[PDB]
Design a protein around this ligand. Sequence first.
Ligand SMILES: [Mg+2]
Ligand SMILES: [Zn+2]
Ligand SMILES: [Zn+2]
Ligand SMILES: [Zn+2]
Ligand SMILES: [Zn+2]
Lengths: 180, 156, 491, 87, 45, 85, 171, 112, 98, 96
Amino acid sequence: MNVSTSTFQTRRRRLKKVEEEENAATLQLGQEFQLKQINHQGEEEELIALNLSEARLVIKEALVERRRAFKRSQKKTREKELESIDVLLEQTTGGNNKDLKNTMQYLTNFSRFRDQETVGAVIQLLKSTGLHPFEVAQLGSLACDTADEAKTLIPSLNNKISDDELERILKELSNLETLY
Amino acid sequence: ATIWGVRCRPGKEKELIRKLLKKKFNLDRAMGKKKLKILSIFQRDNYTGRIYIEAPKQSVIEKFCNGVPDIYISQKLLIPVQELPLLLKPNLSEVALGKTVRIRSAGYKGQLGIVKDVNGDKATVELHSKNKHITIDKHKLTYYNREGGEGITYDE
Amino acid sequence: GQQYSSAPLRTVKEVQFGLFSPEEVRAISVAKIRFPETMDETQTRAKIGGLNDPRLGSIDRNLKCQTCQEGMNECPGHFGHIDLAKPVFHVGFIAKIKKVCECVCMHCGKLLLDEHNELMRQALAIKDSKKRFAAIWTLCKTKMVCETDVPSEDDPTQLVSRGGCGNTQPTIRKDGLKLVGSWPELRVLSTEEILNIFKHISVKDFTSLGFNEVFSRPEWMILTCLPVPPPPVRPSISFNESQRGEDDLTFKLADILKANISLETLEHNGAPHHAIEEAESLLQFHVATYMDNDIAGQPQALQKSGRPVKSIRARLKGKEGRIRGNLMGKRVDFSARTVISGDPNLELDQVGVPKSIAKTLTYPEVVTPYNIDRLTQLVRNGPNEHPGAKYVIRDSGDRIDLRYSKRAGDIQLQYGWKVERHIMDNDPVLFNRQPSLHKMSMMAHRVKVIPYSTFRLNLSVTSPYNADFDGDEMNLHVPQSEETRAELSQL
Amino acid sequence: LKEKAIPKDQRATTPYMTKYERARILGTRALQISMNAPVFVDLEGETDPLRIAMKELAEKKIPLVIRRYLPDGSFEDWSVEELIVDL
Amino acid sequence: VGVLAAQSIGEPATQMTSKVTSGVPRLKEILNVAKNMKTPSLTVY
Amino acid sequence: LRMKHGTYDKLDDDGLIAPGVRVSGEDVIIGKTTPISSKRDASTPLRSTENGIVDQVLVTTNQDGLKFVKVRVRTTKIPQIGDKF
Amino acid sequence: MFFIKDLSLNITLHPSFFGPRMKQYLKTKLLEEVEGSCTGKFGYILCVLDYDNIDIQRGRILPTDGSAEFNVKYRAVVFKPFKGEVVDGTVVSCSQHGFEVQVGPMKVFVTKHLMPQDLTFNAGSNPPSYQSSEDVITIKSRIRVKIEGCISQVSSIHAIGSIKEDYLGAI
Amino acid sequence: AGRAALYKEVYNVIASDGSYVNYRHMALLVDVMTTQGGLTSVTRHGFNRSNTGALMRCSFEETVEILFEAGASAELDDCRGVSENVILGQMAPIGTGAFDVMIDEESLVKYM
Amino acid sequence: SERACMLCGIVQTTNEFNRDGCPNCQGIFEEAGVSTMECTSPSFEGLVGMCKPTKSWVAKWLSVDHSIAGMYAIKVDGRLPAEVVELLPHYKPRDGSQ
Amino acid sequence: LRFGEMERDCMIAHGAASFLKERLMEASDAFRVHICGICGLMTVIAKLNHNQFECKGCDNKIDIYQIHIPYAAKLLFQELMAMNITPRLYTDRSRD
RNA sequence: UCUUUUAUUUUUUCUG
Ligand SMILES: [Mg+2]
Ligand SMILES: [Zn+2]
Ligand SMILES: [Zn+2]
Ligand SMILES: [Zn+2]
Ligand SMILES: [Zn+2]
């Protein structure tokens, strides 16, 4: 259709007809959304996922150093943050691209953690649990109260964790929720 | 069971069976007590290019089909007994263009020619004595009527 | 063609080979061809469902393909498909089908041998597919029976069940276009039975043989769904304005489709099993002459005029074929030929060019601020003088011809445009003697405009070209790009 | 896979510009100068793109790099000014 | 170099004019490894 | 309809060029129309690489009664350099 | 669900554009080409990361044309919805046939054949709304939906949602 | 010994008429003819039966037969051949296509 | 002009029917009181050039062995009248029906 | 003029690859054809006016690439595909 | 305000 974005896994797709594994939330991901992934220098690594709070923080950073790049190129509570991030995007992008604006609005009316230190603590804790990046991103993203409830939201997570430990991580996350 | 299928040219199964059968009455009238061993002859509209004759021996069929044009007697096959009930089952289915002109200060002076194409400010003319096209301004050339005679400049 | 497209610009770097599957043909075809009539019926050219169906591609200048809506200049042609009522062998793979059949069991679809046999393991060990296939064929020719059990390596007396049926194998032979098995119970093997065994052959069974499951599976060897080429593969000829002749390939497709219609109707109606046989033989003959018109020991198919029909091997094999004739070498624009003359007053690296050839050929140069004044002078001079131009290419691609444009003074040149200026002095141009028997017989010279009608070349150069001035002819090829003038100059 | 790339060290190829190379760099730069790329040397009344590219190569001021593909799919990047063009 | 050698060996063949066969037929015979030989010879010192 | 690039002014009312008039390049010499059920010309232009004088023209009727024409064109060839002797 | 991922793009740059501003011009073109695009194969490319550290390697020069193709390597957060996932979103519009739920950058459509019986549309409300015996659904309300199917278009993705299982509803 | 004897015979053929051709052309000829196990003839049954590119093989005499064989065997051609790149219409790796030219980003920015 | 009988299948000119009627079925037609025009039809397919009634096994199938050597069509379209169908119980339809 | 096999051969000997390209592609015949990643056939319904590219059978709409090849090569490949040979054009080097 | 045609194949003849 248009100029697309290439891929690094040198796929063996030599005339094999449409045989992609069915798109599902039971770890039956696509051919390119696999646990293993090739880095920029050519080393195999585990997929890295992140929560909504991470999404807001990394987007905020990326915007920031983009502004600092624009600047050196030219050399030679719940409302103030919204307004600052809005004017940040407006001065960054031309304005025609409304998709980034919509994503801004969604991520800024929905996310649990506002602090980088809380974010790092949660990432370390999810590392200690050692579950799938998709799983831990979902757990840090959605709100849960009870073990059976969380099993219902993620039926794939049947034989992956004990009920006691799921309750433990859940109450720990509940304490780590910030009150805006 | 001795029913043999024979190739022949398509579109004339009707006429070939007609010629065979008329010939057969002629023969049977001609001969005496001994009369030739051909039992039946037929064909199908669906299966063109072929006839089917039931007779006991190859030389009898050959002797019978001598004198018949267009029949390919050289291709015959003995139809196996099993294929016959199915075969015989009853139910199957500007004013300066193109004008004569002379040049009057150039190396080609006195050359008649014919205007072919004009590109603006300059006209192309084919020399009437030589095989060449030459480009030269029209205001500087003299135009004549179809026939030789009175001459006028570029003012028509 | 010549238009903007938003897809990435790309160069190919491999060519995979294989066979079409019938399902692939059915899925890739745009239309089904069922009516033998090509066109002219009821004075309509769009014969829907027949040969030269518009969905297969534009037949003439209409700006309407019904598939891509891009016209003949851009349409790459789209195939139809015709599903034969019975399968028919491929001419190119008659020997291959015989080879596989004698390699494999004709009832259970298994190789006559297995890795239990030492010679078989050695044959399979060969990495290269062709020699491997040859080894298995040479080994399985000797075997003429399916052993349900084979002696074991640990104990010769002990017999291990290899599997498969116990039917004795037949001797296969080639009679005309069909295969005949002698078991003797001599009988022609039905192509349907052959295709049955070929599908029943297992994945490992042909992976060991020179075949790939994904690319060329052995049942794909047999035609079940003939793909009908698009109109550009079979363009029609015009004897006169009213008399139009369909291409040889189109005629053969029409004949095949008539044969298929007759065969399927005869299947639907009563099947005497010998009328079916003769119809199948005629269909196979028609396919075979359509795709290969040089079968040894067989009458050759004649056209209406009594001459051989120009088939696929006929068009792809000879020196005038598609590879040797139309791809290895092929006709060229921006080139001239004429008689050569000797001119000792010309430099070694320099060749005189006739003025007429100079005014004919052009080299397109892009506009720059360095040569804007020069190109303005040339566009003012026009095609009609030697220093000038014949066309100007605008940025949008709209090309204006100066002969047909009267406003040449008004046309103002802009950067990024391209002017097809004529070849001037000192332009590198390749110069070729026709029996080009060696490298030095093709070299680039510097153009010298000279009014006369022969290629004047300095006369020490006649030795590499092996040229006289006794009527010999030589070619001049004008490079069309600065890249190419550069490589011509320094190589 | 970037392992096929050979670093600047260990390069086992000729430091001298091949004639085919010099042909391509002169052609490429002549084409770019024709299509209005910037000029890196003083224009001393030279209008021919090929000759401007000649002068640029002589001054060793062409911002181009030859990826010099080895037979196995490996490669070596050679900077054009780093190449010694003597012929 | 392969094409260069091919042309360099093909060019003399065109201009080719006690016995042993030589010339274009001999060059063809060398190129075409032939089991049978017109003029076999064995030089034993 | 489709006419040729040749100049049609030289052709006479009968559609046939008379001798003594130059014909050059793609100039038409025989004016043809091929009606079928708008005039749809089918003339025969002169050769692009040929120039000369129409020397003779003959009109007859073939055995079928159809009109037949034969047009002879004359030119002078002076030796040039490329000429072979 | 917002995965950071490895992407790369081919950018073809015409010879006139070679110059000192090679970096920033290609930077801007890359941002225009990537921002706002959507593909079914990859999902939804929301924002390219580490702008200042994107490596523009040695770009090829095409043979026929001086145009240079640069393969830029970069990191970018990509989003793709999956069948069978619980997500919360805000209703943007309502109708008798559906009410459209905004989930991240894209919208989820829910059909009445997969809704509880108690929920009933009323056309007497301005804007039109759906009422139940324990909750009221309106445009300006957050609602939890269960994505079961996804269909990809030329420049968008659409998701099919339902609410039958526990804890799926409006908060 | 076969290779060197065949070189000697070719050299005798070239020198019989007095023509002198450089050694390495003959050397490369004999080496291609002997690069496999035995003496691969320059014929239909010789080099054209090798495992080179299928399109290159059909560029020789037996075109359609080889193409049928390649389709049957699902042969993959790497497009490193002169005939392949000629047929498909790319700049073949002949003398200048063996490499590609690349913009020098760092030097361009540094000189400015 | 050609017409085909619907009972015995004898095919011949409508003229020769008008002169001599049906030679094989004359008795049955007279007994049933039906003219040959109605019991013949013009539509027929599958001719038979018929020679040996007593010896042709094709004739044994087609029920012509009791007729004279002649001109017989395997199909003759139409339904035979009841006033002869009842009186010839051994007859079967010649169109392949029944 | 017919750039014969001999002429091509002398150009190979010379090494002027860009010339041999420009002679056999730009001068003689150049056609852009669209192909898809999966099967790599010239049966892509490419409606360039609407910028929509289709390949029935493989169902893809994204992995579409344009390639410039000679009309002679295009027509040979069509001919072979009629001939049940697959001149299948691909991108990823797998054997390396 | 441009566009705008020159059938195909089988044979023969010679040219280098
Ligand atoms: Mg001579
Ligand atoms: Zn189309
Ligand atoms: Zn068996
Ligand atoms: Zn009767
Ligand atoms: Zn596809």
